[PDB]
Amino acid sequence: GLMQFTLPVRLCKEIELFHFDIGPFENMWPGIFVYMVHRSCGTSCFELEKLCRFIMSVKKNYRRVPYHNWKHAVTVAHCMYAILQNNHTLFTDLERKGLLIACLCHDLDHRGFSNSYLQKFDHPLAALYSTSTMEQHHFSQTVSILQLEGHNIFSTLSSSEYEQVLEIIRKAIIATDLALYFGNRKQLEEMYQTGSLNLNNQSHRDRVIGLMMTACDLCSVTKLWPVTKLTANDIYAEFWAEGDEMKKLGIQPIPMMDRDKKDEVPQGQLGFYNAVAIPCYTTLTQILPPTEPLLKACRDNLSQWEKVIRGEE
Ligand SMILES: Cc1oc(-c2ccccc2)nc1CCc1nc(-c2ccccc2)cn1C
Numbered sequence: 001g002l003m004q005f006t007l008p009v010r011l012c013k014e015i016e017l018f019h020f021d022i023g024p025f026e027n028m029w030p031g032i033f034v035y036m037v038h039r040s041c042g043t044s045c046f047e048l049e050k051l052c053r054f055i056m057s058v059k060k061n062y063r064r065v066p067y068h069n070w071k072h073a074v075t076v077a078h079c080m081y082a083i084l085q086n087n088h089t090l091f092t093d094l095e096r097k098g099l100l101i102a103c104l105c106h107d108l109d110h111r112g113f114s115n116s117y118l119q120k121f122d123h124p125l126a127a128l129y130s131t132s133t134m135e136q137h138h139f140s141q142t143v144s145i146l147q148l149e150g151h152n153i154f155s156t157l158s159s160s161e162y163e164q165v166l167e168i169i170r171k172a173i174i175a176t177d178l179a180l181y182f183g184n185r186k187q188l189e190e191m192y193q194t195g196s197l198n199l200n201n202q203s204h205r206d207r208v209i210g211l212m213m214t215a216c217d218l219c220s221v222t223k224l225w226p227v228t229k230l231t232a233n234d235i236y237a238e239f240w241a242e243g244d245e246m247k248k249l250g251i252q253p254i255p256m257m258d259r260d261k262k263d264e265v266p267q268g269q270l271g272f273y274n275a276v277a278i279p280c281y282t283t284l285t286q287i288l289p290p291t292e293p294l295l296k297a298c299r300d301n302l303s304q305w306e307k308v309i310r311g312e313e
């Protein structure tokens with residue numbers, strides 16, 4: 001009960017900032033996550049013995065893919081930690097518990113391929129789940145791990161609290177399907193502008209939590225330039241492998257996944273910041289003003305990609 005996790009002074013300070021990088025020491029990532037749960041939620045939210053066993057089963061069920069790996073999971077959880085810490089009073093006890101676990105589990109058992117590739121391959125998961133294929137799998141994998149003996153970190157919730165937290169995690173993980181982000185942000189934009197946005201409205205909260213999930217999931221665009229630039233290599237290393245597999249199925253991939261079109265990456269990143277990232281963190285900043293540093297970091301990175309195109313790097 002009286003056993004805190006403590007971090008070295010530089011990590012203790014920088015972990016509070018949106019742009020924190022969790023570093024190349026894998027063995028420290030479980031401690032970083034527990035640290036965040038204790039500060040965000042309390043030292044009582046979870047049985048430490050059970051939380052530790054859950055974290056390591058979750059780690060074990062992420063694969064050794066270039067980007068959609070255990071580091072991504074912890075990175076996405078840290079961004080949620082930063083949003084929750086900067087918006088103390090806006091979130092319930094249950095929401096704080098659920099969303100950090102959701103972020104940790106949101107890409108469980110990812111194979112480094114898109115929903116599109118699963119469908120064109122005719123993968124069994126695409127028969128089991130016709131939309132948000134990988135995201136329904138990620139939620140399924142979360143529930144499985146929660147049902148391992150000694151792994152139910154929610155055991156001490158009431159029946160109804162338990163059903164609510166699993167329903168928060170399910171919506172949170174489904175919302176990381178980027179195909180659903182565009183419609184969710186349009187709706188949130190309309191509600192904010194016409195003044196109808198109401199955080200006591202469960203369907204409105206759901207939408208806001210969905211945008212938070214997209215913002216945390218894309219947070220590589222909100223880091224210092226060198227982190228953003230090196231993550232982009234991991235992201236394209238998966239896409240190009242998927243492009244290779246499309247060619248094997250006798251389908252030309254979209255340029256994004258065709259390693260023959262490496263040259264057009266800087267322009268591809270521009271389109272993505274303008275079409276997805278900037279609108280995401282803009283609408284998020286409108287709804288939750290203290291998340292503005294994510295928009296400011298994203299804009300700084302948009303400018304770095306502009307410099308790359310102009311041949312200044
Ligand atoms: C889908 C996506 O998500 C992220 C990402 C980045 C940082 C965090 C999370 C996600 N980057 C991308 C690639 C963006 C993109 N590149 C191209 C392109 C690239 C090369 C050649 C031709 C086209 C098109 N488009 C849309």
Ligand SMILES: [Mg+2]
Nearest residue numbers: 106107134176
């Ligand atoms: Mg995902």
Ligand SMILES: [Zn+2]
Nearest residue numbers: 106107176217
């Ligand atoms: Zn993700």
